[PDB]
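COMPLEX REQUEST
Ligand: XES
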Amino acid sequence: GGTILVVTGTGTGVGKTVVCAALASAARQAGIDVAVCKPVQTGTARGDDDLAEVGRLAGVTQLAGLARYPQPMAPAAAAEHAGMALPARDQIVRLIADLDRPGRLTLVEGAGGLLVELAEPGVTLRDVAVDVAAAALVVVTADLGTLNHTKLTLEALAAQQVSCAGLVIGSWPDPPGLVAASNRSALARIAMVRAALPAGAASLDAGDFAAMSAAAFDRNWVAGLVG
Amino acid sequence: GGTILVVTGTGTGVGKTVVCAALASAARQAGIDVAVCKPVQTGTARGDDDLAEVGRLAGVTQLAGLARYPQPMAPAAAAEHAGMALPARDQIVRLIADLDRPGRLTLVEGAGGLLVELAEPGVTLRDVAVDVAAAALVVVTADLGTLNHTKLTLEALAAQQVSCAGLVIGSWPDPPGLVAASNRSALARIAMVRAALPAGAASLDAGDFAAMSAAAFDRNWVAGLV
Ligand SMILES: O=C(O)C(C(=O)O)[C@@H]1CCC[C@H]1C(=O)c1ccc(-c2nnn[nH]2)cc1
Ligand SMILES: O=C(O)C(C(=O)O)[C@@H]1CCC[C@H]1C(=O)c1ccc(-c2nnn[nH]2)cc1
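STATUS: Structure written out below.
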């Protein structure tokens, strides 16, 4: 196949979707074919639709979903509230495997953070990453508390031998305060920081988002993801 | 000795100090002698002094600490900003062991969450809990995202064979809401929920806080701690 990369985060609202869009944009500009999938999407009754947002920001057309739940809650709770079931583990894996292809970067966007239940019983994006032999890109904030959450998430990845592809700061303030600057230096001692997306990136138009994305990542790292 | 419990949280600002105070108050009312140790405290420039708050809310007098940094930052960053090192691992472990005594509940309050560096070099409250053979009480929120952070923290405790003494919800909203209610049910599927402190409890006077605390915890669990 190609390269499968799960995109997780330290939590919800940390920048998973905009990072997915930014990496997708950078890879497409490098001539890499990109697919993005969001196997579990909650909050659809609030307008949450991460695949649509990635298409809007990055131009990705190869978008794949599976489960959609109305309430903006954790998947298990949103499914319960809608009277629906979570997907099965093998259904999530099938979605991803159908996309995987030599030369293609397939990004698998999680729901919330790494240990959120996506399938019964207690199957998480970590388990899915093992099934499809994917590394994990971890989206983090620059805010107070990020170092603890990042180290917790990386330890959890290592516990199941899921390689960490690096960190991305989802929103980087301009100018940075003392806490944000300190956190960025400390994050870079824990793992490679692949990018720090400028605050407000999700509000850029298509052309400005593309330029931001190309400058945000190291071109050699993006090109090295897919042979 | 007695019973040592580290009191950690899924992060910072989740209610660790008020939970320390609440458990201390419930234990004191059960006739248990209580000490509270906050080895490292930051944010003292704006007035943060968690030991003073525990003393006022719960009446604890054995209040022990080693280091206080003015800036409201992670300990390592606050120490770097001040140009001074964090305390030594030996200082923290020995202070706690010295506080511990038969018939006493010694609560050790961390700074931020479980994997925060408290001593040089890279020593955390988890490492301290291993050294003094303490179980860990985990303070969690009721808010969106709490389940992931709680599961991550519990996995990290288990990875170094630190027993989990349960969870405490640091602030229970009024009215709760669908997410808070769902999270409270889900948290109980992960570990014992020992208490859920009403929102605003940190503003109570000592008498009102004691009444809140005694009702918040199961009296049999508190008495069983020592
Ligand atoms: O949480 C506590 O104890 C607080 C309290 O004393 O009230 C402290 C108040 C000032 C900062 C906070 C702290 O100490 C802290 C802040 C951020 C981090 C962190 N972790 N990962 N990234 N940053 C760790 C600790
Ligand atoms: O974060 C994402 O993916 C968001 C997105 O679709 O962009 C989703 C928007 C709606 C909810 C959020 C989600 O899916 C979610 C929310 C809370 C939790 C949780 N974890 N622990 N306790 N609660 C887990 C997932």
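REMARKS: The interface with chain B takes residues 11-13, 71-74, 76-77, 80-81, 112-116, 144-145, 147-149, 151-153, 155-156, 159, 178-179, 182-183, 186 of chain A (CB under 8 Å). The CA atoms of residues 147 and 187 of chain A lie 7 Å apart.
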